[PDB]
Design a protein around this ligand. Structure first.
Ligand code: CLA
Ligand code: CLA
Ligand code: CLA
Ligand code: CLA
Ligand code: CLA
Ligand code: CLA
Ligand code: CLA
Ligand code: CLA
Ligand SMILES: CC1=C(/C=C/C(C)=C/C=C/C(C)=C/C=C/C=C(C)/C=C/C=C(C)/C=C/C2=C(C)CCCC2(C)C)C(C)(C)CCC1
Ligand SMILES: CC1=C(C/C=C(\C)CCC[C@H](C)CCC[C@H](C)CCCC(C)C)C(=O)c2ccccc2C1=O
Ligand SMILES: CC1=C(C/C=C(\C)CCC[C@H](C)CCC[C@H](C)CCCC(C)C)C(=O)c2ccccc2C1=O
Ligand code: SF4
Lengths: 165, 645, 172, 253, 123
């Protein structure tokens, strides 16, 4: 079984390593597979950011919350989050909701690339053979691979904590 | 032949009637080192560099000679707390008051770090410095007159040059200095700190000395080797050994196969290399200025406060000057290149980069100086709780107060260096950032608007140094990259002056605070800097006017020379104002009247008197401005820190 | 694009630039024969068909190999344009008067600038590279094209007949 | 090739080194290289040395020649010609599409993406350049959907929305960070100051509309600057409303 | 009669000596009736150095900088629709205007500095 051509060699152990061992790709229209890639990339970007936030919270770089709590916040990111007031947590929820609204109602993502919330596909050309420094597919694969790795890494951090301390 | 060509510039000056003016003389001086593009440009550059190395060797030999003959270096060795003086002053006129001049260059601490205990060693070093200067002059002669063209060193042989500098020069010099430390600078300091006499340094290279007296390789030696003046040398030796190892290993583990100067002409390549080299040297000077008081490395250095202040201020000034010269030579290389297509992205984002930097500078200036003026106004209005201070609205630099990290077998520098920062530190650091940003703005604007601009569209045809394009388009004065460097030098002066003021006030505040006594342990604020460096009035009163007592009351004391240099610096600075505010035409007409007076008496000089050109006038004004300001700060700092410390 | 450039047309943003220049600067006017010196001097006429306004040209074959820069004219903020029409013998690189570098076409070339000074600087550069027939035009707000620089066909460095002296004062 | 670049001994220059020198030198440059070029010195040493010419040279002259001539690898390696060809193709392409670097830690770090810096409509326009901050779809639909540009909004709606935003923002920096900070009426004083700032900027906008008459928002017919003036008036109204709402949310909760 | 012979006297005994009370117009301890004059002293120094700006730096630089600032305004969002730089075009001060304004700041700082010093010295 080969890639559904809308993903088209965009992941796996190698770039052309269509890996689905569950039939989550078959008999699915291109819009649904684009949705799957958009969800994967959003989950990734969120993870990749969350891992950095975790490691900068677990390394003592926990200002803005050092001041809010008016005392040194916990290095454990879960306990640090629990220390935050509900006002701050709901401000974070509201800001993420506003961001999600931005990329749906006023700034909808491109139809053929829903993961391109910034709409970067309107200013970049493509990877072409005339370009000696063409790396756009390479950086897309870097983003995807670090996304897939951080998606399991952040879960490792979260479930490792709150169950082992 | 060669002697005939030595005055060849003057012969060419007098050959043509067009060059029989004083302006020709000033051009001959201004275009002295401006080595024109030719087949021998690289020879000329390398020979000039070697000649400068010889000059610096002459300077080092003179300094060691003064240490040997005109210094109390031995008395300072017997008692480091005494004033280091290395310049005798003869009894001529009436200058006998300042006969011992306390030198603040740190040569005594340096020589002690080198294991020098006898003035005979200083005599030998002076003699070998003269020999090295003679060798450098011989080599410079040879290279200018009989050697390879050197035109391949920046484009073709750049890999060889870079690899040699990485391995041989840098790594082998660091390794040799580590060997010198471990072998004669550590043992001599051990035998001086313990007071057990020092043998000849070569006797330490005997394999029968402490090298094999005990094989223990940690902090344990005869009696009790607990000298903390000695440990910085141990750390320096370890650092040099590690640096030599990493340099040697990484040089062969580096690509180095990327020369960005393929697209530049040889002259522009030389200017760009000079610019980047000046940037590196200037930032290195600033880094050393910070690290000199950040970390103790020389024996009895922190104790000698005038030496610490002088090293910091001098290296800050040199770093600022070289950072400005970096952009100066980048502009020279860009404007003097035929096809400088390499900077295409930045010459096409000209206005974007310049305008964003303009907004950054505007924001930083309004914010920082508005914090200062707001504190001034609130204190004047009797509203101390509305100011920006610790007892008021607190601008605590939170980003400064955190360096915690996983240990992984580390220590010491894992924190804020054990110093707490306050609102005054925040505001003065933002002032520093703003002034640096403004200097960079002027320099980057000069670089970007060097070949063309929205006002004048053929500025590359005008070369690097031109007075203007004319009074048209409303006025186009000071558009040249040279004029941008000219303004950036003023702003560098402002930035570095504020930086050294901040350092000096913080240093004096810390000295006063550690002079609590021993029992006094609530410094509250006190910390005269932290309590008063929040207003412009606070500075003007508690730093300038307060510390000027030492420099203005120095008459009849050994610091009378500092007082006189203070006055002379003010004089030169106002003369600069004369040169900067005025213009060439007026002085030309005045010289016309004076020359009529001359002709009336049959005097009639043929080198026609012409007043300084526009660029020459600006350069003279800038030179006098820098000299006056820097000399005023020099006299003020030295008098204040020598009289009070 | 609305964030890249203002959404309104250049004429809308101009407002009453005309009928206010006639009031703000009543002295600012051109003489009856602007590009020339005498009324009986041929006065070659060109139209928008020959040299169109830059907003009407997209990816024109006569444009040189230019990658765009922030230093160009202000579209939608200025309406006056100056155009250069020069014919090349070979495809080589040259400096744009607004910094950056472009590469000339093999045959006809066409550039647009805001100020005439940029066009004259480019003409000087091209003539230094042995290029004749460098014609410089001016584009007005309404699209009227005025032919400049070699106005009578002969470059001003070379004396030509039919050129009446202007602003000549018969004394020292 | 040229007669003097034939059967050159390896001692003067390597065969690979000669090939690299020729590759990195323009074809028309041959037969008369410039004094500062590598090919000129290579030519000068190509004669007077080799075949029937002088087969020996003094050691000092040999050192001179070795210093003045390339040594193939790491100086004229095939990778260096590949990099030069890549750089010239890059500079050819940037007249067109430009690779995107970002200055990270003060040094430009290549990202991997290449921009469309060339303007879409007017090639020589200085403000039609394309950047992701100003030409990506997010920017176009973000600035385009703001009150100042959103489609379907009457002028009063744009004014009201902008005013509500400004007024709700302006109450902030006055209630705290003000003369009457630690007072029960801090919120009220902040509200009054925010309303004053809204009124002053609205008077400034009225001044702009009366002087410049921007005309960018006027409907058909009407008068010059009518749309902008309506926008500014409803901005004043919205500023009062947003400031009052912020004061309400401060007094409550 | 003794210290006016040498200029260090003119500094120490006149300027440095007579500024002691003026600078104490306001400090951390508080502010007295001379606070207004210390504030005016600082204001006059600021005006004098702004005159230095207008006298040392000349037009062309500033004209190019203002051109770049105009570029920022015309490229800025929410404002290119409103300001096309056609109305009261921002240009750098002419050379004569710049020289006069620099001289004016110089002499304004001169007068205000000396007035504040006279008040603080002879109060
Ligand atoms: C999925 C991403 C994610 C999420 C949910 C959080 C969530 C949180 N972070 Mg955080 N952080 C992240 C990524 C993330 N971070 C990254 C990538 C960095 C590196 C710049 C940081 C750096 C950071 C610091 C330095 C601090 C937090 C803090 C916090 C907590 C308070 C919210 C706050 O003030 O944020 C502030 C977040 C920023 C200033 C960084 C914004 C960068 C975003 C992710 C780019 C988009 C909250 C639990 C603060 C705290 O008190 O923790 C308890 C705190 O001191 N984070
Ligand atoms: C780095 C450069 C440098 C500088 C700035 C000085 C500066 C000085 N030297 Mg000096 N010196 C230097 C290098 C330098 N030296 C070197 C390289 C040597 C070794 C040859 C000496 C050997 C030397 C001696 C032997 C003496 C000085 C003296 C002096 C002082 C007075 C000079 C004098 O009388 O002028 C005279 C100038 C001329 C006659 C013109 C020729 C003055 C502080 C004198 C001093 O300190 O007196 C107490 C003194 O006796 N110097
Ligand atoms: C125009 C201003 C001016 C004047 C009139 C003088 C005049 C004088 N200065 Mg003086 N000085 C000046 C500016 C001036 N200075 C400046 C600007 C400075 C700062 C650098 C000094 C610093 C200074 C010092 C440090 C000393 C003097 C001394 C002297 C006196 C001795 C001069 C001497 O014997 O020369 C010697 C030269 C000659 C006598 C020339 C030879 C005779 C001629 C060739 C005869 C020709 C044939 C008839 C003399 C009265 C000295 C003093 O105390 O005396 C009271 C002294 O020690 N001056
Ligand atoms: C291990 C050998 C060795 C050593 C110790 C040095 C040491 C030095 N070289 Mg050097 N150089 C070397 C090999 C070496 N070079 C080789 C092989 C070449 C040929 C490519 C050069 C070409 C060269 C040039 C062109 C220049 C130096 C310069 C310098 C001096 C300053 C370097 C600097 O600040 O950066 C620079 C320094 C004394 C500079 C100098 O001051 O000249 C005297 C300078 O301009 N070198
Ligand atoms: C490694 C350091 C270095 C080197 C090798 C050069 C080399 C060069 N620079 Mg340069 N420059 C540097 C650092 C350097 N610069 C720095 C740090 C700055 C910023 C301050 C500049 C600013 C600068 C400008 C603005 C210009 C140059 C120019 C030049 C070229 C001609 C220089 C000339 O003819 O001067 C001849 C020598 C002099 C004029 C020396 C006169 C003395 C000076 C002006 C004042 C010294 C006062 C002294 C310290 C105090 C006296 C003592 C006191 C007690 C009385 C040459 C390529 C010029 C050029 O056209 O380049 C192509 C040019 O216009 N440079
Ligand atoms: C520029 C520096 C500066 C700063 C930061 C301050 C700050 C302050 N001054 Mg002050 N002042 C300054 C310079 C400055 N001053 C100068 C130079 C003078 C001399 C004339 C004074 C004279 C002065 C007096 C006489 C008084 C103050 C007072 C105050 C306080 C209240 C001011 C107020 O109402 O805020 C108004 C603030 C705003 C309207 C908001 C502006 C800032 C916003 C947040 C910018 C946001 C930009 C945004 C992020 C852009 C991105 C948007 C995009 C993401 C959509 C405040 C602490 C008062 C006081 O006593 O309080 C302690 C007072 O009575 N000042
Ligand atoms: C510097 C002070 C100042 C200025 C110039 C203005 C200016 C203006 N106000 Mg205003 N206003 C201010 C302070 C100010 N306001 C304060 C402190 C309050 C609170 C009491 C108000 C409450 C207020 C209301 C309730 C209204 C205005 C309105 C107006 C506009 C008529 C005009 C733009 C009117 C308006 O919206 O105009 C369109 C209007 O209805 N203002
Ligand atoms: C939804 C509309 C609304 C509501 C419910 C309130 C509610 C209140 N306002 Mg209010 N206010 C509003 C809009 C509103 N405001 C607007 C738009 C303005 C600007 C003109 C003001 C200006 C205003 C002032 C100036 C004052 C109030 C005050 C009050 C309180 C009585 C109460 C909490 C008073 C207060 O501070 O009570 C604590 C008071 O003095 N309001
Ligand atoms: C943070 C962040 C951000 C953002 C920022 C901002 C921009 C903010 C703002 C915010 C805001 C700024 C908000 C606002 C809001 C507002 C409001 C909420 C208002 C309301 C109002 C009202 C409701 C009114 C009403 C009324 C009227 C209408 C009139 C009459 C009266 C009344 C009152 C009825 C970003 C993304 C950049 C990035 C980083 C993060
Ligand atoms: C004064 C002045 C001149 C005139 C300057 C001239 C003619 C230079 C000649 C001055 C001579 C060479 C001074 C010689 C040195 C002095 C005697 C002082 C040094 C020695 C003493 C310390 C003993 C200009 O040409 C000029 C041009 C552009 C802007 C401003 C100005 C400007 O201000
Ligand atoms: C800073 C500086 C500028 C820039 C300064 C300018 C453009 C003037 C600053 C204007 C101030 C900031 C007021 C701006 C407008 C105010 C809103 C007041 C308007 C008043 C009118 C309505 C009358 C020059 O133009 C210049 C020209 C020649 C030599 C040196 C310099 C120079 O140093
Ligand atoms: S004042 Fe001097 S520098 Fe300025 S335009 Fe006139 S001649 Fe040139």
């Amino acid at each position: 079984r080969e890639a559904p051509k809308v993903l088209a060699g965009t992941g796996g152990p190698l770039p052309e390593s269509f890996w689905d061992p569950a039939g989550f790709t078959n008999n699915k229209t291109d819009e649904e597979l684009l949705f799957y890639r958009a969800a994967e990339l959003k989950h990734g970007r969120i993870a990749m950011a969350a891992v950095v936030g975790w490691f900068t919270n677990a390394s003592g770089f926990h200002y803005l919350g050092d001041l809010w709590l008016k005392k040194p916040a916990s290095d454990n990111p879960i306990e640090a989050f629990n220390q935050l007031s509900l006002l701050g947590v709901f401000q974070m929820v509201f800001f993420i909701g506003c961001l999600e609204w931005l990329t749906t109602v006023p700034c909808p993502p491109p139809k053929d690339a829903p993961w391109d919330v910034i709409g970067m596909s309107d200013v970049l050309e493509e990877d072409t053979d005339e370009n000696p420094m063409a790396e756009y597919k390479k950086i897309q694969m870097q983003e995807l691979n670090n996304s897939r790795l951080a998606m399991v890494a952040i879960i490792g951090l979260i479930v490792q904590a709150t169950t082992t301390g | 032949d060669f002697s005939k060509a030595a005055f060849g510039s003057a012969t060419g000056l007098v050959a043509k009637a067009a060059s029989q003016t004083t302006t020709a003389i000033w051009n001959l001086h201004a275009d002295a080192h401006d080595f024109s593009n030719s087949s021998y440009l690289s020879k000329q550059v390398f020979a000039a560099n070697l000649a400068h190395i010889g000059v610096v060797f002459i300077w080092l030999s003179g300094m060691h000679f003064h240490g040997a003959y005109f210094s109390n270096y031995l008395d300072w060795l017997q008692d480091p707390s005494i004033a280091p003086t290395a310049q005798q002053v003869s009894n001529i006129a009436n200058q006998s008051v300042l006969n011992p001049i306390r030198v603040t260059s740190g040569f005594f601490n340096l020589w002690l770090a080198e294991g020098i205990t006898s003035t005979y060693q200083l005599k030998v070093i002076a003699a070998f410095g003269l020999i090295a200067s003679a060798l450098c002059f011989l080599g410079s002669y040879f290279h200018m007159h009989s050697s390879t063209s050197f035109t391949r060193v920046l484009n073709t042989k750049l890999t060889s040059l870079s690899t040699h500098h990485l391995v041989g020069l840098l790594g082998l010099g660091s390794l040799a200095w580590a060997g010198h430390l471990i072998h004669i600078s550590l043992p001599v300091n051990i035998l001086l700190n313990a007071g057990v006499a020092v043998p000849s340094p070569h006797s330490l290279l005997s394999s029968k000395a402490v090298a094999t007296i005990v094989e223990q390789l940690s902090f344990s030696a005869l009696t009790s080797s607990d000298g903390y003046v000695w440990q910085p040398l141990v750390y320096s030796a370890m650092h040099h050994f590690a640096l030599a190892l990493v340099l040697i290993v990484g040089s062969i583990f580096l690509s180095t196969a990327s020369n960005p100067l393929m697209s530049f002409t040889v002259g522009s390549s030389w200017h760009l290399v000079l610019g980047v080299q000046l940037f590196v040297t200037g930032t290195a000077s600033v880094l050393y200025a910070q690290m000199s008081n950040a970390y103790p490395v020389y024996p009895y250095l922190l104790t000698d406060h005038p030496t610490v202040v002088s090293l910091f201020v001098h290296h800050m000034w040199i770093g600022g000057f070289f950072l400005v010269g970096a952009f100066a030579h980048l502009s020279i290389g860009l404007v003097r290149d035929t096809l400088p297509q390499s900077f295409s992205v930045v010459l096409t984002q000209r206005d974007i980069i310049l305008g964003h930097l303009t907004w950054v500078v505007a924001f930083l200036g309004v914010h920082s100086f508005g914090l200062y003026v707001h504190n001034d106004t609130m204190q004047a209005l009797g509203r101390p709780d509305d100011m920006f201070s610790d007892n008021a609205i607190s601008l605590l630099p939170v980003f400064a107060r955190w360096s915690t990290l996983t240990l992984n077998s580390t220590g010491s520098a894992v924190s804020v260096l054990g110093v707490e920062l306050s609102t005054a530190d925040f505001m003065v650091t933002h002032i520093h950032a703003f002034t640096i940003h403004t200097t960079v703005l002027i320099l980057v604007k000069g670089f970007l608007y060097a070949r063309s601009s929205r006002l004048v569209n053929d500025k590359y045809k005008l070369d690097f140094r031109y007075p203007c394009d004319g009074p048209g388009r409303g006025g186009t004065c000071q558009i040249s990259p040279w004029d941008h460097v000219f303004l950036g030098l003023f702003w560098m002066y402002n930035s570095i002056s504020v930086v050294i003021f901040h350092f000096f006030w913080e240093y004096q505040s810390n000295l006063a605070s550690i002079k609590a006594s021993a029992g006094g342990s609530i410094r509250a604020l006190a910390s005269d800097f932290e309590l008063n460096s929040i207003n412009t009035n606070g500075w003007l009163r508690n730093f300038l006017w307060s510390g000027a007592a030492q420099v203005i009351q120095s008459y009849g004391s050994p610091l009378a020379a500092y007082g006189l240099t203070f006055l002379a610096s003010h004089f030169v600075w106002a003369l600069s104002l004369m040169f900067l505010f005025s213009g060439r035409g007026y002085w030309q007409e005045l010289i016309e009247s004076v020359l009529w007076a001359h002709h009336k008496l049959y005097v009639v000089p043929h080198i026609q008197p012409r007043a300084l050109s526009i660029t020459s006038g600006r350069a003279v004004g800038l030179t006098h401005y820098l000299l006056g300001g820097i000399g005023t700060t020099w006299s003020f700092f030295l008098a204040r820190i020598v009289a009070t410390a | 694009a609305v964030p890249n450039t203002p959404k309104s047309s250049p004429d809308t943003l101009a407002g009453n630039r005309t009928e206010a220049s006639a009031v703000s600067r009543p002295y600012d006017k051109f003489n009856v024969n602007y590009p020339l010196s005498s009324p009986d001097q041929a006065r070659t006429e060109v139209t928008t068909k020959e040299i169109p306004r830059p907003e009407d040209l997209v990816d024109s074959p006569k444009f040189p190999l230019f990658g765009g820069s922030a230093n160009g004219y202000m579209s939608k903020a200025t309406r006056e344009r100056h155009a250069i029409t020069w014919t090349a013998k070979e495809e080589t690189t040259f400096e744009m008067p607004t910094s950056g570098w472009a590469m000339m076409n093999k045959g006809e070339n066409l550039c647009y600038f805001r100020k005439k000074e940029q066009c004259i600087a480019l003409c000087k550069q091209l003539r230094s590279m042995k290029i004749n027939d460098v014609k410089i035009y001016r584009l007005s707000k309404d699209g009227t094209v005025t032919f400049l620089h070699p106005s009578d066909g002969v470059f001003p460095e070379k004396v030509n007949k039919g050129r009446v002296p202007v602003n000549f004062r018969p004394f020292t | 090739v040229l007669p003097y670049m034939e059967n050159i001994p390896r001692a003067i220059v390597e065969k690979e080194a000669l090939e690299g020198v020729l590759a990195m030198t323009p074809r028309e440059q041959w037969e008369d290289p410039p004094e500062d070029s590598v090919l000129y010195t290579l030519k000068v040493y190509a004669e007077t040395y080799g075949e029937g010419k002088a087969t020996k040279m003094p050691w000092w002259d040999w050192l001179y020649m070795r210093f003045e001539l390339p040594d193939a690898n790491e100086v004229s390696a095939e990778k260096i010609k590949l990099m030069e060809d890549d750089a010239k193709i890059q500079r050819r392409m940037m007249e067109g599409k430009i690779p995107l670097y970002v200055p990270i830690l003060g040094v430009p770090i290549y990202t991997g993406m290449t921009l469309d810096w060339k303007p879409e409509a007017e090639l020589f326009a200085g403000d039609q350049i394309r950047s992701p901050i100003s030409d990506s779809r997010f920017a176009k639909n973000f600035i385009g959907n703001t009150a100042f540009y959103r489609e379907g909004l009457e002028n009063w709606q744009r004014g009201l929305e902008i005013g509500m935003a400004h007024g709700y923002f302006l109450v902030g920096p006055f209630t705290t960070l003000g003369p009457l900070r630690n007072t029960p009426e801090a919120a009220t004083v902040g509200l009054l100051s925010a309303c004053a700032v809204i009124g002053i900027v609205s008077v400034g906008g009225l001044l702009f509309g009366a002087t410049v008459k921007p005309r960018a928002f006027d409907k058909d017919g009407a008068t010059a600057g009518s749309g902008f003036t309506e926008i500014i008036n409803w901005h004043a109204v919205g500023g009062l409303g947003g400031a009052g709402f912020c004061h309400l949310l401060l007094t409550l909760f | 009669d003794e210290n006016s012979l040498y200029l260090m006297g003119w500094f120490r005994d006149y300027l440095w000596q007579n500024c002691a009370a003026l600078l104490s117009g306001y400090d951390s301890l508080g502010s007295n009736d001379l606070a207004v004059w210390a504030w005016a002293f600082l204001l006059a120094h600021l005006a004098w150095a702004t005159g230095f700006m207008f006298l040392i730096s000349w037009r062309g630089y500033w004209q190019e900088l203002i051109d770049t600032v105009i570029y920022m305004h015309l490229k800025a969002p929410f404002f290119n629709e409103i300001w096309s730089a056609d109305v009261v075009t921002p240009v750098a001060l002419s050379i004569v205007q710049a020289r006069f304004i620099g001289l004016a700041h110089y002499v304004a700082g001169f007068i205000l500095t000396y007035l504040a010093f006279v008040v603080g010295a002879t109060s």
